[PDB]
Amino acid sequence: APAAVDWRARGAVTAVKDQGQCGSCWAFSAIGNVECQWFLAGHPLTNLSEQMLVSCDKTDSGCSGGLMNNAFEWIVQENNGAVYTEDSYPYASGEGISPPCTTSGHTVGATITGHVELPQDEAQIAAWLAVNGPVAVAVDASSWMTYTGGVMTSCVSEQLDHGVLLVGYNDSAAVPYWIIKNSWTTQWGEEGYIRIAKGSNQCLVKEEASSAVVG
Numbered sequence: 001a002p003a004a005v006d007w008r009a010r011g012a013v014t015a016v017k018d019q020g021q022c023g024s025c026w027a028f029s030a031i032g033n034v035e036c037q038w039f040l041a042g043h044p045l046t047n048l049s050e051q052m053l054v055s056c057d058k059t060d061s062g063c064s065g066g067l068m069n070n071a072f073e074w075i076v077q078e079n080n081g082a083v084y085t086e087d088s089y090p091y092a093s094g095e096g097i098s099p100p101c102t103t104s105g106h107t108v109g110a111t112i113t114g115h116v117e118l119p120q121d122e123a124q125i126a127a128w129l130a131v132n133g134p135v136a137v138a139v140d141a142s143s144w145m146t147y148t149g150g151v152m153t154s155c156v157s158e159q160l161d162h163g164v165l166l167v168g169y170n171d172s173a174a175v176p177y178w179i180i181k182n183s184w185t186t187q188w189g190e191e192g193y194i195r196i197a198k199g200s201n202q203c204l205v206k207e208e209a210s211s212a213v214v215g
């Protein structure tokens with residue numbers, strides 16, 4: 001694999017978002033992955049709808065949580081592969097409730113054909129990301145309320161509870177690290193991003209890695 005990758009500098013990553021009071025991290029993780037995969041398939045970088053998932057994917061639980069792999073399966077099985085534009089289905093859950101699903105009045109921004117579940121191995125995840133792009137992952141975020149910048153050490157690694165997006169890595173740094181897009185505004189972390197140490201399963205980062213497939 002390359003020594004380092006950062007998709008943020010290569011036109012593939014949209015702006016950092018704010019999930020607000022809703023437990024919708026799973027939707028921000030899945031949609032951020034689709035946005036990146038859609039661009040890397042040769043389509044324009046398009047802002048896509050988390051609200052579509054939060055309100056309409058009834059195989060997940062709205063502001064009470066969900067699984068990125070359930071979301072990817074719902075898009076293909078129940079929604080004809082479609083992911084709506086943000087502009088046409090804007091985020092409406094910042095107060096902490098999921099409003100009722102709207103089943104018309106939206107425009108398709110992207111489509112997916114399926115998804116892949118990656119091995120529980122940090123080097124194998126990095127190799128896949130270097131070629132195919134950003135990867136949805138779950139982490140234990142319980143220590144992330146102390147993060148201020150730099151490469152975090154000693155992440156509490158007990159129980160997966162938070163969905164986020166791997167956008168790069170650097171194996172050549174003094175301490176090798178992952179680069180992760182969070183959904184807690186740009187005032188948090190490094191303009192909304194966090195770096196964690198790579199190679200010791202920090203925050204359980206290797207355990208539930210997956211990606212949509214755009215054909």
Ligand SMILES: O=C(N[C@@H](Cc1ccccc1)C(=O)N[C@@H](CCc1ccccc1)C(=O)CO)OCc1cccnc1
Pocket residue numbers: 022023024025026059060061063064065066067068070138160161162163208
């Ligand atoms: O809790 C979650 N998912 C987690 C993320 C996750 C993804 C993959 C592996 C492990 C963790 C999730 O969505 N977390 C939510 C919080 C969910 C929550 C809300 C109220 C009280 C307790 C917890 C987030 O916003 C993460 O920041 O899903 C429960 C679920 C499972 C299947 C169907 N519906 C819900």
